[PDB]
Assembly symmetry: C5
Homo-oligomer: 336 residues x 5
């Protein structure tokens, strides 16, 4: 009763060459690909890469595997995978892709009577996702995932998504858990690229990422906001208290300087100004400007005290208003 | 006397196919799984992963391995493991699982006359354990461990725990040693998940983790507590000592600011406020508020000194009481 | 003359099964283990692990390998190691063990006429060594090394050390070079553990480690000691110099606070107080207490200056004596 | 119709030795190499290495593979690659080179009737790129890429670029994306090196790198520039304000000191002065010199106040001019 | 014409056993080793290890490989390397050695008619180089490289350097490029070690390393030197300026303290004082002593101002002279 299956497997492997694609010189092999994202690994901004774990699957038709028997399906494992022909699928953007071999190589091979073949594999792809940090942290990233044949051009092997976009790519509810990103959706597409070796079909899947704010607020913005308010306290102190007001100006300026250096330690070493950088620079101007007002006041406090006192009183009102007004423009400009 | 065993092994391998599960098309294969945790590796909060070393074991019935001989058991090693059929067990949540091959691949294969098979393997699983750090550090984590068949659905292979929960999962006394966690217990369960490929049984084991407090007390809370007390010292200084009291307010505020940044360096970059963050913010208000009182006093110390002196004396009593009262509410709220 | 050896090897492999232990069902296999430590790798306190490189060797008797020839010994290499049976030795505590394959797999196989077999292997074991940091840095660590059979219980395979403890375990003179530890000696032992799978003999080797002090003295203790002395300088300053004495108290307190945070960065995140922590806390009290005395003096310097002056003069003598006395108790308590 | 291809493959492998190069003892094997850079990985300055992902390809003529059939080309995969002879190409400067095996080993093997063979491979090379950081960050780096035969000297195997330089080496538009470098172009060349083993042809490809400035401006230069301006504010303060001006000099000097240490943390530990180091040193002199002027003024402010006041007024103009003039020389000298 | 080579290879492998060394029981195998250092990797002081890439080569005589043919040499690749016998050479001090397999395993096998065999291999050795940091950074390190047979004692296999020391070991001109070391030369030697397994010949190569100074000057020495000068500025300030002089003493002392902690972060955690540590301690005394003089002056400035003024004037001259004199002794003592 079990020996029947053994004979079927031997017959299929008899006269079957794994080095030749099905329907060679007779038609164009058609492969249907479906992907399931078990978990979306962390997105490393420093290296412009992200880690994703998926159960990649491919379906194709092979007439050489036709068989007749009481059972309409033949579930199997990785043992027979190497005995037959499989597409040389690879990721054009993947920097380091490895599979899982424990406890057993996570592979499946299901064959039907008509010859249809299902082959699912588990992979962890450390693909590269370039990011334009011009509106950072109010930036949206579209990380793609490109894969295709390595040796078979479009004229021989063609990859096509199965059913609609939703069924083609599926993400687990708990898989999309990123500490500093939100998975807003997924999209798929196909295209042909012209290469010296030939034309190859490219299967591209794009993931929409919306960075979640709140970590930088407690890390960079809030210390800067409170630092500016700290400097404004000097405006409420007496002019003759030269030493007391000097500490506020010097300490606040240095505090802002170290925050900028510390803030960018985690940020990638990008050679352009980000939105956060402008906010820090503006905050630096307020604290720096406050010290200049105190220095200017102390220079003329002996000649014309009347004007010096007026400026100090005016500064107590003008500076808070400008800082508050600036925030509304800054936050509204990006949060819209 | 020894040659008898050699003949038995040859007979079993004669006509035995390792690509077909036992009892194919006749019944449903039943597998009993028992796990022993040699050591519970570190729990990395930054990557939301934990490392665990276990001696995973599986038991199943195979009639093709029946034999008769003087010895009722046939202890063996990994050499014969590849010669027979084994389940394609895998961890649905494991991110990187590897075995130990030194000195020899840590595997066993014991076979009885009735055909029962025992197969134990040693593995190190770097599984992912998402955590909700809303009550951090007063948070309880339930890290699961999900595993099951990769190619055989529930209709063909079924996993069931052996005996009770205590016997099914065992943790070594010295294995459960975490520098910042306590292993409060273990639990097991089974469920069926509906997938496009089919229905698969899932064996889930949950470990109860109770974070141990005391490291953060010496790291974050105590410096904050002493910093607040340091600011309150300014209330005991003379009002005319403008410079002396200025140092306390400025230095304390900056000290709190750097602690918040330093404290969250180890903490995961979560985009929400934790319990520790609120405690820091409240402590920041006290030190920041103290400076405001000094600034307010210095502004009116010339017009109405009577009220200014009253506030300074009152501040010496009100502020310590509020800080002490706040701690009791904060600690009692979470420690209960 | 050389062809004679070739025939001998072929004869031994004829009818020899590597899947069966020698003397199966006739006696209990006896294995003698000798270890040589080429180099004792670094001891990582953060991960509670240590790296050790050893030339592990095993000796056992096998009658199936008996041969007669002009040469009494047959030196060989790893090529024939896989062709015969070897014990499934493994480390019960090893977290990641790997061998060296360059230039050639470092293995030997020597066989005598009587059938005795010598098999030496080179390994690098990243074992786990839990430590109780209650007296840190005045702590002594006893890192064990447990290994034994994985599939053969005590009733089949037994491990016994050869000769005495000194000969069984040998450490190279230059191998025991640790930047923050001293290798005070080695010890060995054997025991039987009862397991669900059966009873297995355990070969445990313990290494005595005595942490060497001097790195923390220049890193933590000395800055703390000098910081306390710095605060005491304020006692020699005039009371009216409110600003001058304020800097000492504030700066010293903050300096101690940052040292505690910086000091524990390298230390493991243990949720209990160490001996160093108590020393820091005591030093923190002295600097903190000095500020309180200055604040207390400034509060009553106008009402009863006589008592205020007396306290300041007394503080110059009392505080240094207490700090000096405390050190003698602290150092003597642990250094004894 | 498909069986025809199978017979052709068997015929070619019949009597074909993969250990012998084509045309042995009859001519000199000629190999044409073409390279495509999929992505130029990060350039690590600390380790003087860079990561590059390329689709390395080699073409050569082999008469032993001649065949006749309806199809003029025989696309294949890695399965037949090991069955034939391939050059032992290697990178003379590569420190760690690994290929990608997922989903399938990324290799191709195309054979024509005339016997021409195309063999493309995907590799990730962590080559070493020594850099002379004398004009850092205004430095241009020329990272080479050397490869050639390991066992076949120039008299047997010769490597030659195909077509022109542009076609020989191609870089993807999105591949050349470096956070702190610009890919200004590529160049190729060939040379013969005399070695004890023999003469080997070397294929060298040089990549022109132009470091992009702007990250260090926000990291090092700007804090230094603002720090110098901060010190100059003391020149506008009254001489009798000894305490107020003391803070500026001390705080600014320490701020510059920490920036130099922090700035070089990312920079490689080079034992020579860079252009940035000189800029920091000059900025340090200005802040340090300003303190000396204040100290000098305070020393003679009692004897000859007339000269002291003149210096203070003059310093307000001289110091800003020198700092501004120095920047123009510094920036113009390197930015030209 | 090409088939002749194929027959020769088959004949040599006929009756050839790779498990037996040449001339077994007839003589002692002699192996000549020559080494070429392609590049000397970084020397990691923290782990007391260094990385080196070499083209290790071995030459020996084997009469079993004698052949007659038109070609006097048979260049080959790694394919035939495993088919013959090769020495089990290994590095007695190497902690992790791996080869390069891309594009092809970098190995060669050349055989002459007389039977001489040449076998060159490329390796990357992460050997351990213990260092005595007593004169750090004015320290000279002699990193050795020990290798020899693992299974064949001196009585069977002997390693001898070929020709002189210069030819035996060769270092590329661009290979010896270390950011903090100079390669002053190389030396070789041979010795016999007595081991329980037997006597083995050891081939030791020593590399002379002279640490290059200049990185620590800009990192540690210069900030310390300028810090001491900064403290001496207080000697030029008026005694009554208690607050002004207090900042210099406190700020300088703390600045020195943090430099010592920061300086040793990169330095290995050695439990003894280095030359740099003594320099820091001496610099700490000067800044600390200066504060004591100010405190002492302020204590007696009211009783006997005459002596207080004299000390302040004297301090302006004595302290700079002692610091300058100390440097000459310190630098001359080690730089000689
Ligand atoms: C989409 C094609 O199928 C796959 O991609 C694929 N390949 C393997 N497994 C799947 C399926 C897909 C949907 C969810 N899913 C699993 O997560 C899973 C769970 C199992 O239960 C322990 C066993 C196997 C799988
Ligand atoms: C639960 C099924 O058995 C396993 O999971 C299993 N597999 C291997 N070993 C075990 C057992 C389980 C209980 C403790 N235990 C060992 O730790 C151990 C110790 C030995 O002694 C050196 C030898 C073998 C094992
Ligand atoms: C104790 C059983 O023997 C071993 O554990 C063992 N195994 C290999 N080698 C040894 C010996 C042991 C003592 C020192 N020792 C080596 O270090 C060594 C040195 C050699 O010379 C290059 C060659 C081989 C070895
Ligand atoms: C220059 C010799 O050919 C190669 O170096 C080579 N080798 C493989 N593939 C290429 C080509 C070269 C140009 C771009 N290019 C690919 O990126 C590519 C894209 C494909 O489509 C999914 C499939 C294969 C390749
Ligand atoms: C000393 C024994 O020979 C070796 O150690 C050895 N082994 C391989 N290759 C060498 C030689 C040694 C001298 C320089 N040298 C190479 O760098 C090299 C360069 C080549 O050209 C691309 C091809 C092969 C080698
Ligand atoms: C790619 O080529 C195939 C050839 O059949 C064609 O059907 C398809 O439309 C092409 N795709 C694009 C985007 O041009
Ligand atoms: C899963 O399916 C099996 C089928 O036999 C059933 O016995 C079991 O009760 C199911 N489990 C759950 C949780 O529904
Ligand atoms: C372990 O078991 C063996 C069985 O022969 C016995 O000889 C030995 O004494 C036992 N060891 C201990 C520690 O009980
Ligand atoms: C290298 O050697 C070949 C031998 O044919 C010669 O043609 C070529 O010109 C040489 N290259 C150089 C740069 O000398
Ligand atoms: C090592 O042993 C060999 C044996 O032939 C001898 O020739 C050689 O001199 C010995 N070397 C030393 C350093 O004793």
């Amino acid at each position: 009763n079990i020996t029947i299956f053994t004979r079927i497997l031997d017959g299929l492997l008899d006269g079957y060459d794994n080095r030749l694609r099905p329907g060679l010189g007779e038609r164009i092999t058609q492969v249907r690909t479906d992907m399931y994202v078990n978990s979306f690994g962390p997105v490393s901004d420093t290296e412009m890469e992200y880690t994703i774990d998926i159960f990649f699957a491919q379906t194709w038709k092979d007439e050489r595997l036709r068989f007749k028997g009481p059972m309409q399906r033949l579930p199997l494992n990785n043992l027979l995978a190497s005995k037959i022909w499989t597409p040389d699928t690879f990721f054009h953007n993947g920097k380091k892709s490895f599979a899982h071999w424990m406890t057993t190589p996570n592979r499946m091979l299901r064959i039907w009577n008509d010859g249809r073949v299902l082959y699912t594999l588990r992979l962890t792809i450390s693909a590269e996702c370039p990011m334009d940090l011009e509106d950072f942290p109010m930036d949206e990233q579209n990380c793609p995932l490109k894969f295709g044949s390595y040796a078979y051009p479009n004229s021989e092997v063609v990859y096509v998504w199965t059913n609609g976009s939703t069924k083609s790519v599926v993400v687990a509810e708990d898989g999309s858990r990123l500490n500093q990103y939100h998975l807003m959706g997924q999209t798929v597409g196909t295209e042909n690229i012209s290469t010296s070796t030939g034309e190859y079909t490219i299967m591209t899947a794009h993931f929409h990422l919306k960075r979640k704010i709140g970590y930088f607020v407690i890390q960079t913005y809030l210390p800067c906001i409170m630092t500016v308010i700290l400097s404004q306290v000097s405006f409420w102190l007496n002019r003759e208290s030269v030493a007391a007001r000097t500490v506020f100006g010097v300490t606040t300026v240095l505090t802002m300087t170290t925050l900028s250096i510390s803030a960018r330690n985690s940020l990638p070493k990008v050679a352009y100004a980000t939105a956060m950088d402008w906010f820090i620079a503006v905050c630096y101007a307020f604290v720096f400007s406050a010290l200049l007002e105190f220095a200017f006041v102390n220079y003329i406090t002996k000649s014309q005290p009347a004007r010096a006192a007026k400026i100090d009183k005016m500064s107590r009102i003008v500076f808070p208003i400008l800082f508050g007004t600036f925030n509304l423009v800054y936050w509204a400009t990006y949060l819209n």
